[PDB]
Symmetry: none
Subunit: 397 residues, 2 copies
């Protein structure tokens, strides 16, 4: 059960586990307490499974969206750093770590989407979403394509949708307003309409999957794709002079991408916490800490005001972060799981013809509210299961 | 259909049905009105059934909590005395009898848990939850545990959890906010935590139940125990020089359990109406009306400030009442029938290291809402289902 007098940390194999085992040594040769990392196949389960009963690691590394469901179930011994530490990094990052208003996890890395172009084919990109049609019939004219991305999925579509008005739930002062779902409103209407007005004017496709997004831009076709840092490696593979800058602005309004903060929280039943304190504080952070991580595997835009600043001399990194300033924190609330499906169906109909813009987005918000039910129910089942299992244990006699 | 020109009343077994015979004879002599009392079981089932058809008694006696399901289903007549009558009883007992603000029943008797100790092993008891661990150590030394009581149920474990500010729902303004469930704050946190640490530090095991604990005290093998007025008989039987006192405080804050006011409502149909109040008012709510039941059935405490102050020279009572005054009034709104299942689980889970404190409680709100909404299901489907008969009886019936 737990640790006591040591310190065990979990982070995903894919992320630079090596920086930790380094700050492990930094810690080991400074306070005299042993730190190690573990990268178990999909810890997502492992953690809340045994963390709920005490045990697991003392600390954890993962995207902030999932932390909600952990903090919801009661796992993170909410953190306490002073103004000094809070001020040491970006204010909007702090908005990404609030459940019931309280702090929970320390924010580490930040991923958001950018505009990747082909300089050999395209100069000074656009800067407004309204330029791209005038681009296409100019470039499609020479046998090419203006733009392409994942139109099949919805994580990718929101950037325009939200650009004007359209949001998920409004937070309104450091929480989430469950009622104030801002889809079928001013912004979403003309947001989505634009896209249908593209596909109907042949500029975009519909069948477009993710492969086709990556594959097409990669072969010098479609000099205009939108993706995140995870494909940056697969552009040196192709070797196509790119790329990466701030997204175009629809209706003057900045495009609105989603933001996923890595960050790290602390198991409540982990007797150490104080050791996670000074360790996470001024060992893990402070250039060096992050330096050591993002070296073995880059983290992209990072929480620390000073460090993100230093490697921002990368024209790619900078642009990602600039999309974070004018973006939406991925709400950690479990309501999001629904929003996905409801919006996913709304995009499949939007330009499918099977339905219309206005009517798709209304039926979606109408359906998104109608999903809480499905959850209230899902949870009711999960509750019957936690009484029925006591009955099952009473059944063996 | 009820009565008309009389008064027909139900009560229960452990309720001294003859006690009212004095009150129904004193009523019959002064105004000349016939007053028959019955003692039928399955009252809580056969009453809401008959009072739907306008039948049943003109008046009822039970604890306020069941009255929630009744009041809601419009079964009870709004009862209006006077603010100059309202001061004859304790104003708090009044906070315990109001469905959606409006008054619905006359309060009778108070039931809360009390601290029972043994003057032999401990002549003057602790009184602070926090001291309680050290005592086991003191007593355990000669044998005998400090404390053994029911750890399976939550009515027996909640008093401490609420201690630091934990609560089922929120009162204020004469209503209960169905959303403000306080079983997850620091009060709840420290409450449960503090308890676990008594099992943890082997002051008692989790397998202690109701009979297991009571038997152990009745043989004088634990110094203290906690229970209500249903023991007394059983402890006098054991001839143990005991005593009843106000419960221990945690973090200076006084503990507080759920209370249980016995009360009297009026059938909305009950054509007598005018005869009910008159009866309760002055024929059942003086010293005597209360006296007359006491001789039959000892009702621990009573809400009548006047008559209460009288039996108070009994210490076993003054302690109960003190406990109730400083106590969370048990609610009557349906969701409380859900609260039991949700909280019972959190308790047994932490009492096992099957999950943690913080994990049990924030995940009890899940279980709570889940019932409160499934509760809605059962109720609602029980429309369609029970409407299937009137569907077919009226449709045809061959
Ligand atoms: Ca899929
Ligand atoms: Ca709206
Ligand atoms: Ca596929
Ligand atoms: Ca009449
Ligand atoms: Ca008193
Ligand atoms: Ca049924
Ligand atoms: Zn692995
Ligand atoms: Zn065009
Ligand atoms: Zn440097
Ligand atoms: Zn009987
Ligand atoms: Zn101890």
């Amino acid at each position: 059960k737990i640790e006591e007098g040591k310190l065990v940390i979990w982070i995903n194999g894919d992320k630079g586990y090596n920086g930790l085992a380094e700050v492990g040594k930094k810690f080991e040769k400074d306070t005299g307490i042993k730190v190690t990392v573990e990268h178990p196949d999909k810890l997502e389960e492992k953690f809340p499974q045994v963390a709920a009963t005490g045990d697991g690691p003392d600390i954890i590394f993962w995207a902030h969206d999932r932390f909600g469901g952990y903090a919801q179930s009661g796992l993170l011994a909410e953190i306490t750093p002073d103004k000094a530490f809070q001020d040491k990094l970006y204010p909007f990052t702090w908005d990404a770590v609030r459940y019931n208003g309280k702090l929970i996890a320390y924010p580490i890395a930040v991923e958001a989407l950018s505009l990747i172009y082909n300089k050999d084919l395209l100069p000074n990109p656009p800067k407004t979403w309204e330029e791209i049609p005038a681009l296409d019939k100019e470039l499609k004219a020479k046998g090419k394509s203006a733009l392409m991305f994942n139109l099949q999925e919805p994580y990718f579509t929101w950037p325009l949708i939200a650009a004007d008005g359209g949001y998920a739930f409004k937070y309104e002062n450091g929480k989430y307003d469950i009622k104030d779902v801002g889809v079928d409103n001013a912004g979403a209407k003309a947001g989505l309409t634009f896209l249908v007005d593209l596909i109907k004017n042949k500029h975009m496709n519909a069948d477009t999957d993710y492969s086709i997004a990556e594959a097409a831009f990669n072969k010098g076709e479609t000099a205009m794709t939108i993706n995140g840092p995870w494909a940056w490696s697969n552009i040196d593979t192709s070797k196509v002079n790119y790329g990466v800058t701030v997204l175009p602005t629809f209706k003057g309004q900045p495009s609105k991408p989603f933001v996923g903060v890595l960050s790290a929280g602390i198991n409540a039943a982990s007797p150490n916490k104080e050791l996670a304190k000074e360790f996470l504080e001024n060992y893990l952070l402070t250039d060096e800490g992050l330096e050591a991580v993002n070296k073995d595997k880059p983290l992209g835009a990072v929480a620390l005001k000073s460090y993100e600043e230093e490697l921002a001399k990368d024209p790619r990194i900078a642009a990602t972060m600039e999309n974070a300033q004018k973006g939406e924190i991925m709400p950690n609330i479990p309501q999001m799981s629904a929003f996905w499906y409801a919006v996913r169906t709304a995009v499949i109909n939007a330009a499918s013809g099977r339905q219309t813009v206005d009517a798709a987005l209304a039926a979606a918000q109408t359906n998104a509210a109608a999903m809480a039910t499905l959850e209230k129910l899902m949870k009711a089942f999960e509750s019957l299961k936690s009484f029925q299992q006591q009955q099952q244990q009473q059944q063996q006699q």
